[PDB]
Amino acid sequence: TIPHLAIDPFSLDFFDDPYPDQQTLRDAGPVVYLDKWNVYGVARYAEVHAVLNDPTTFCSSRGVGLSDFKKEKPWRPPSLILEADPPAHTRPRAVLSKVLSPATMKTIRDGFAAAADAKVDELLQRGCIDAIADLAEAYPLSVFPDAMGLKQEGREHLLPYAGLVFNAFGPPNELRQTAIERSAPHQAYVNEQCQRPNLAPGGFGACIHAFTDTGEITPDEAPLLVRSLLSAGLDTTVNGIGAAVYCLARFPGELQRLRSDPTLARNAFEEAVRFESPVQTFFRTTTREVELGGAVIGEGEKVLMFLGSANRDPRRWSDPDLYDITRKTSGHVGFGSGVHMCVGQLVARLEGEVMLSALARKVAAIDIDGPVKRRFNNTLRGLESLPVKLTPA
Ligand code: HEM
Numbered sequence: 001t002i003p004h005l006a007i008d009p010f011s012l013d014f015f016d017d018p019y020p021d022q023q024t025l026r027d028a029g030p031v032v033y034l035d036k037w038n039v040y041g042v043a044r045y046a047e048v049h050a051v052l053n054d055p056t057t058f059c060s061s062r063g064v065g066l067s068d069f070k071k072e073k074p075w076r077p078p079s080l081i082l083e084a085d086p087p088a089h090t091r092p093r094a095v096l097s098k099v100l101s102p103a104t105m106k107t108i109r110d111g112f113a114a115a116a117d118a119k120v121d122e123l124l125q126r127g128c129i130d131a132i133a134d135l136a137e138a139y140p141l142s143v144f145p146d147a148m149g150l151k152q153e154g155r156e157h158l159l160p161y162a163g164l165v166f167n168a169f170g171p172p173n174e175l176r177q178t179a180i181e182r183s184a185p186h187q188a189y190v191n192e193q194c195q196r197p198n199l200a201p202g203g204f205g206a207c208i209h210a211f212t213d214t215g216e217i218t219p220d221e222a223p224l225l226v227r228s229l230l231s232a233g234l235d236t237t238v239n240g241i242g243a244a245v246y247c248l249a250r251f252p253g254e255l256q257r258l259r260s261d262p263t264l265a266r267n268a269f270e271e272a273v274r275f276e277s278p279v280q281t282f283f284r285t286t287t288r289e290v291e292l293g294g295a296v297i298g299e300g301e302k303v304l305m306f307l308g309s310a311n312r313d314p315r316r317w318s319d320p321d322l323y324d325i326t327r328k329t330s331g332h333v334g335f336g337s338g339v340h341m342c343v344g345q346l347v348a349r350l351e352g353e354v355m356l357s358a359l360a361r362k363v364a365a366i367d368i369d370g371p372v373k374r375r376f377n378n379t380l381r382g383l384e385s386l387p388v389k390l391t392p393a
């Protein structure tokens, strides 16, 4: 009843160009079985959205990677928010929601915007730059560690640690095994910065620790919740901003529309998140036998969701393979959906918006002018190098 496919969604060939195989996964059926890894797969929007929104049946506390925490030891202590289900999830979630709240965005917007404008001005002086190292990486590195309250020393550990986190959601392939092999120094740095004395006043980290006297979290929970922001909040924005620049570089007509109305900046970024989906996949584990899209899945089974595929499913989107900065993007699953829907989405959108605003106001053309190189990760989609010439407006 359920079709069995040999596609390996964690192979380099798949990362290099996932879209044909994603159509094969959607068109094979609402639910497939991936023989390579002994997991169920769902690649259509409807079932991805259904799974995300039934956290009781499709739980997160047995891990959102391939590994089942009921069978194997997690490679690091479980996340108190990502790898927890209601009700344990609920209070740590509320703390992070308040730390990264609508009201908090007002305190950081001016500095984030000024840093975005300054970076674009700097890049225009060079003309030919690498939109990954010099922009997608450099801009978040210039604002987010400081917003966290991190010291300057050791920040070179942050992107490697995040890449490790996202590789570790994958199967035990070479990408994952190599990441874990190299991890000890990055884990040591990150765990230490999570302790209250090492987080500067007024930053996100200190604000998490300040919530430990409300009864929502205890003091021994705060370091792991700081760990969550350092895990989830940098590399993702790098790939999101990188995707947006890549889209504007490939679709000059949309850059021209964005220049003509810079208030489209926020939706241009949201559309980039739909179109490239920086977080491509992740897993749930069934807690009972369940019927999903006409198929029966047993208890204790890993289910792999394809967020990027759901965001390109023609059953849900008109012209899904077009980058359209005026698209009604509401409902895309690039930030997830439901109780775990990205708690840092307002920080992500703020960064993306202010960067695309700076480009909209200051740049007349973005032309790829060198070899484009992809960056391979078991969970994240993004580029390693994006050589572009920026022409000033
Ligand atoms: C473009 C940037 C980003 C993308 C594409 C993205 C994507 C996602 C997705 C898909 C999830 C859901 C995972 C799941 O349901 O298992 C998630 C959760 C999460 N994200 Fe993001 N994210 C981004 C930025 C950020 C930022 C900036 C932060 C923090 C500053 C952050 C922190 C988190 C946390 C803590 C969770 C877990 C929330 C929970 O489990 O309730 N993310 N993110």
Ligand SMILES: O=C(O)c1ccc(-n2cncn2)cc1
Pocket (backbone or CB within 6 Å): 079, 080, 081, 082, 083, 165, 227, 228, 229, 231, 232, 279, 282
């Ligand atoms: O709590 C953490 O450590 C954490 C939270 C979320 C994620 N993400 C997974 N997919 C997208 N974000 C990774 C780590």
Ligand SMILES: [Cl-]
Pocket (backbone or CB within 6 Å): 076, 187, 188, 190, 191
């Ligand atoms: Cl760690």
